[PDB]
Amino acid sequence: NKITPNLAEFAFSLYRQLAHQSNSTNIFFSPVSIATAFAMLSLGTKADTHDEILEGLNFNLTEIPEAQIHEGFQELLRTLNDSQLQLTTGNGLFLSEGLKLVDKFLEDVKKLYHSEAFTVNFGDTEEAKKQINDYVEKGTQGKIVDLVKELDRDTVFALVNYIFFKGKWERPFEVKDTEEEDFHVDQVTTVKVPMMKRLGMFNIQHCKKLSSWVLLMKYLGNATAIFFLPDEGKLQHLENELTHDIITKFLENEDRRSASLHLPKLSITGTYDLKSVLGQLGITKVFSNGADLSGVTEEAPLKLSKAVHKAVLTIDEKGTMFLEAIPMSIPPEVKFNKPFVFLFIEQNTKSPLFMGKVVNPTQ
Structure with a gap:
């Protein structure tokens, strides 16, 4: 490539x-x-x-x-x-x-x-x-x-x-679990948006170099979605530190951990x-x-x-039966309820199919 x-x-x-x-x-x-x-x-x-x-x-x-x-x-x-x-x-x-x-x-x-x-x-x-x-x-x-x-x-x-x-998510959400939740457009203001949620085993990590949570989720077909949730006041720092080699390290990781993921429906x-x-x-x-x-x-x-x-x-729950073993431990709550960046990658070529930023899902 x-x-x-x-x-x-x-x-x-x-x-x-x-x-x-x-x-x-x-x-x-x-x-x-x-x-x-x-x-x-x-x-x-x-x-x-x-x-x-x-x-x-x-x-x-x-x-x-x-x-x-x-x-x-x-x-x-x-x-x-x-x-x-x-x-x-x-x-x-x-x-x-x-x-x-x-x-x-x-x-x-x-x-x-x-x-x-x-x-x-x-x-x-x-x-x-x-x-x-x-x-x-x-x-x-x-x-x-x-x-x-x-x-x-x-x-x-x-x-x-x-x-x-x-x-179509390889590990999909359940439509019955989608509910209205707060999305923090700024640090003191919220709007209600439809929010998907699921408890599962995710390719997710908090990256110190990016000061962000990095979540990778696989679609049906050869495409992977990468979501970047910056820490408080670190959105601009995240946008500056994104390099291709940092993306390559994420795509190669195979470790999974439990998490309670909240992800907005997007149109x-x-x-x-x-x-x-x-x-x-x-x-x-x-x-x-x-x-x-x-x-x-x-x-x-x-x-x-x-x-x-x-x-x-x-982005929706299913788009159209994998069973994940969840450990007996408190899973971190990872909520994409504030401005976040994302990048969609073709699996074979590693090429950036899409890139974007959500500042307000219902805007």
């Missing part, structure tokens, strides 16, 4: 920037789906436009060959796309119908990255926006609606990237303007009039005017 360290650093860079934009909103995004879409876009770019994209995905081009970058993304798409992981992801390229497209690019999009490319009359902005939104709604079975709200008048190329995940979405967010990471040329997109079309100028990512997560 040669590109896994780069995906992890891209996940942290992308998280740390969003955490700086707003500190009072829930965060949820797919680092893998965003990186895949732009690694695929780089196939149609050249020169500085190409180099900026891969460097913005935390790939040092003086160290890793491009053949290994695309090989890693292709292998990751194979495992994700049989699986019990109820993961639906899609990437849509919408190009002006007047453009003469390069066949090599359209082939690479479908054959290698299993994505979709469409022609659209951007001379009718309202109809172009309706066709883009009907594509995402059909691909999500109605979960994501009216994704694109506006299009620039000179739009000739738009990119949408969507992903929805509803996992969370995240919608992000990738032109703005990735521009803060150094990806600017492909969104500008100077973009080298000669691998997509050769004669006419081309720039990516619109790029949107939306991610939807649902």
Whole structure:
């Protein structure tokens, strides 16, 4: 898994920037789906436009060959796309119908990255926006609606990237045990949220280096959820100390201990303007009039005017008979009833499927 360290650093860079934009909103995004879409876009770019994209995905081009970058993304798409992981992801390229497209690019999009490319009359902005939104709604079975709200008048190329995940816990909660509990949005304020609870044997530990409880729970399929519960006043310290090697140590641990876990039910979405967010990471040329997109079309100028990512997560008790031996001893009460951070990891590749922060489940 040669590109896994780069995906992890891209996940942290992308998280740390969003955490700086707003500190009072829930965060949820797919680092893998965003990186895949732009690694695929780089196939149609050249020169500085190409180099900026891969460097913005935390790939040092003086160290890793491009053949290994695309090989890693292709292998990751194979495992994700049989699986019990109820993961639906899609990437849509919408190009002006007047453009003469390069066949090599359209082939690479479908054959290698299993994505979709469409022609659209951007001379009718309202109809172009309706066709883009009907594509995402059909691909999500109605979960994501009216994704694109506006299009620039000179739009000739738009990119949408969507992903929805509803996992099935390997060791599930009991619906009868879910009850309304306090969630401490700050140190003196609470709100009532639906809270799942179960007594079991967990991959859980209090990490001194992170000043947080670290809980790992396995989904059906090859994906593991990692939840970080920071100690009092240690949320920012937790966000600063997260490194990929720290995640690797957690995933390798096989020790289990008893705990009374309280975990909120979550229905969370995240919608992000990738032109703005990735521009803060150094990806600017492909969104500008100077973009080298000669691998997509050769004669006419081309720039990516619109790029949107939306991610939807649902966490529930079951999602659709392991028996754990519980010792005769007081189990610690681990309650995710205050702001926490999480990261979902694909088991085979160790790649960060999702990352987010919950500041208020019902916000």
